[model samples]
Target: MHAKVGDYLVVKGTTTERHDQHAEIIEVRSADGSPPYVVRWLVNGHETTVYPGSDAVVVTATEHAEAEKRAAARAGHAAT
Candidate 1:
């Protein structure tokens, strides 16, 4: 997916690193359609490059910010 700078990047817990992850797309190496994005993670105040397909959730995950398991009965709330 082609993303512009300032778009939020969210990595779902599907990364196997629970609690989910969120970041800002600080830089986009290619605004065409592919990515090697420069992101600053909101949770850890760290930076990482995001790519697609292999070992990465890159962009699709952002569109799925609300896509996670449901355990609402456990008091796990949903946010907008």
Candidate 2:
């Protein structure tokens, strides 16, 4: 599968009914002999990851009109 930064991805493995989630592709890491991607996604307001073939899907963000929601929220908080 091919993915790019800012794309939304869903992971379907080992999720509880209360916490099933998906996230954005904030970054991708590629190094020889390793998986080509180390994706960064926002799950439950926090950045997280899921490896490919872990029963996942890349879905579209529901709100295409306002992509600024995440940016705006981050602006008010300090990075830990």
Best by TM-score: 1
Could you estimate the TM-score for every candidate? 0.45, 0.42
* RMSD after Cα superposition, model 2: 8.1
Instruction: Give the Cα-based TM-score of candidate 2 against the true structure.
Output: 0.42
User: Number of clashes in model 2?
Assistant: 0
| Whole-model Cα lDDT of every candidate shown, in order | 0.44, 0.42
Candidate 2: give the clashing pairs.
none
Error of 2 at 6 (Å): 0.8
User: For model 1, how does the per-residue alpha-carbon lDDT over 1-80 read when each residue is reduced to its tens digit?
Assistant: 45667665444355565333344566878756465566554433446665433322333434424322221111122221
Backbone clash pairs for candidate 1 read: none
